[PDB]
Amino acid sequence: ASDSPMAYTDGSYQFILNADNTATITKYTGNEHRITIPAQVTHGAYIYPVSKIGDRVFCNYKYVLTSVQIPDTVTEIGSNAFYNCTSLKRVTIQDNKPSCVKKIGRQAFMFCSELTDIPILDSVTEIDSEAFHHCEELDTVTIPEGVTSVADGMFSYCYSLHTVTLPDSVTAIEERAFTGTALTQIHIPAKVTRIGTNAFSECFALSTITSDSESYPAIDNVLYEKSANGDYALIRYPSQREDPAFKIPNGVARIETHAFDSCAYLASVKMPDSVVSIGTGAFMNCPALQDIEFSSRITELPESVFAGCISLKSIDIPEGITQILDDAFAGCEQLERIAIPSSVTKIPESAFSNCTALNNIEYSGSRSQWNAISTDSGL
Ligand code: NA
């Protein structure tokens, strides 16, 4: 269908009729700053309980909006229902009754950056992608038993969110689910079998990691992904961990993207030769990082790998690296010396951008070989 179903009006609300003799609110035509979703609507000879807030009803609401009250008849909140309601403080249940909300749609509260009170989460079984993306004032969240995954970007950039309780029923934490949050600790429940890329990237306040998952063990307070073949990928080193040095264990095959981003204290890192690849921005914004011992089996320095590593003074790029990608050392203001092997044939101009102390480039090849290095790479 290229059109939505036939809608009726009851006061400031429009609605459609559901197959189970309930109604879905599809439009709001008022301009209140304190919203009360109706528990019932009338059409013809019948009264319909309101079971759903339709997709986008308050999406980009142009008027001032501070609070929303939902009746306990509502079992579903549509996608983008309160998208960009940036002064919305609270979403409560009428008469302080228990929430009956079971499903929350994609981006339902995305950009509700002042939202602090959300009791609608208490009996939910499904929450879709980015439902609380940029809810910058949420402080603690409890996901109830019955939720089976944390959908992608669910709490991305929830800057105040310092504690999240995940239930035993969660089997997946999707991509970017907690990117940029204020989590001080993480507990991975036993049934987690998938953690998506950057689920814990930019977690600047993280100090402890615990896990009951055999697929995602916490080994010496570091989160890993363990593959069926026994290989491990290091996925999250806690940024607030105070140890000046860390040696990545033998048996780790990959340092995943942003695994060591924003480490406030880490000064020295050592890689085993089992490490064959490093993800984008693996050590970005590590301001105390001074010494790096590389694996002999890596062949690339990925994008932004050491971007913002402002204490880095000297670095020896291992023989066998064939390319140094965009922004690899961008903003390394104290970098004075870099040894580049003749195997490096690609270095974009941005790789050493804002490297004002850089006065000693030790290149093991000839001037002709140096001039043959390609400076081409997209963004
Ligand atoms: Na090598």
Contacts 24+ apart (CB under 8 A), 361-364: 361/337, 362/337, 362/338, 363/339, 364/339, 364/340
Span from the CA of 298 to the centroid of ligand 1 (angstroms): 6
Span from the CA of 2 to the centroid of ligand 1 (angstroms): 57
State the method.
Answer: X-ray
- Dihedrals φ, ψ of 119, to 5°? -65, -10
Buried b (16+ CB within 10 A) or exposed e, 25-59: bbebeeeeeebebbeebeeeeeebbbbbbbbbbbb
What is the token pair recorded at 196?
Answer: 């998506």
Span from the CA of 317 to the centroid of ligand 1 (angstroms): 9
What is the token pair recorded at 143?
Answer: 């996901």
Q: Give Cα 72 distance to the centre of its chain.
A: 31
Contacts 24+ apart (CB under 8 A), 363-367: 363/339, 364/339, 364/340, 365/341
Span from the CA of 329 to the centroid of ligand 1 (angstroms): 19
Beta strand pairing status for 46-53 and 40-43?
antiparallel
Span from the CA of 320 to the centroid of ligand 1 (angstroms): 4
Do the beta carbons of residue 314 and residue 334 sit within 8 Å? no
Do the beta carbons of residue 89 and residue 67 sit within 8 Å? yes
Please state, in angstroms and rounded to a whole number, the distance separating the CA atoms of residues 364 and 373: 13
Span from the CA of 370 to the centroid of ligand 1 (angstroms): 19
Span from the CA of 221 to the centroid of ligand 1 (angstroms): 29
Please state, in angstroms and rounded to a whole number, the distance separating the CA atoms of residues 85 and 248: 44
Nearest to 17 by CA among 57, 47, 55: 47
Do the beta carbons of residue 339 and residue 360 sit within 8 Å? no
Nearest to 251 by CA among 280, 222, 210: 222
**What domains can be seen in the chain, in order of their start residue?**
1-379 (3.80.10.10)
What is the token pair recorded at 319?
Answer: 């023989």
Span from the CA of 253 to the centroid of ligand 1 (angstroms): 14
Span from the CA of 300 to the centroid of ligand 1 (angstroms): 9
Span from the CA of 349 to the centroid of ligand 1 (angstroms): 23
**Resolution of this structure in Å:** 1.8
Please state, in angstroms and rounded to a whole number, the distance separating the CA atoms of residues 317 and 365: 13
Please state, in angstroms and rounded to a whole number, the distance separating the CA atoms of residues 83 and 113: 10
Please report the DSSP string for 25-73 in residue order.
EEEE----SEEE--SEEEETTEEEEEEEE-TTTTTT--S---EEEE-TT
What is the token pair recorded at 174?
Answer: 């999707």
Please state, in angstroms and rounded to a whole number, the distance separating the CA atoms of residues 326 and 305: 9
Contacts 24+ apart (CB under 8 A), 278-284: 278/254, 278/302, 278/305, 279/254, 279/255, 280/304, 280/305, 281/201, 281/257, 281/305, 281/307, 282/255, 282/256, 282/257, 282/258, 283/309, 284/258, 284/308, 284/309
Do the beta carbons of residue 202 and residue 261 sit within 8 Å? yes
Could you list the beta-strand ranges (E) of 300-349: 300-301, 314-316, 323-324, 337-340
What percent of the chain is helix, strand and coil (3-state, nearest 5)? Answer: 5, 30, 70
Alpha-helical (H) ranges within the chain are 367-371
Span from the CA of 313 to the centroid of ligand 1 (angstroms): 22
Which H or E run contains 92? strand 90-93
Span from the CA of 340 to the centroid of ligand 1 (angstroms): 12
Amino acid identity of 271? Answer: M
Please report the DSSP string for 209-253 in residue order.
EEE--SSS-BSSS-EEEE-TTS-EEEEE--TT---SEEEPPTTEE
Which H or E run contains 187? strand 185-188
Query: Which three-class secondary structure state does DSSP give residue 179?
Result: coil
Contacts 24+ apart (CB under 8 A), 112-117: 112/82, 112/84, 112/85, 112/86, 112/88, 113/86, 113/137, 114/86, 114/87, 114/88, 114/89, 115/85, 115/88, 115/89, 115/90, 115/91, 116/89, 116/90, 117/89, 117/90, 117/91, 117/92
- With tokens 């008027």, the residue in question is 63
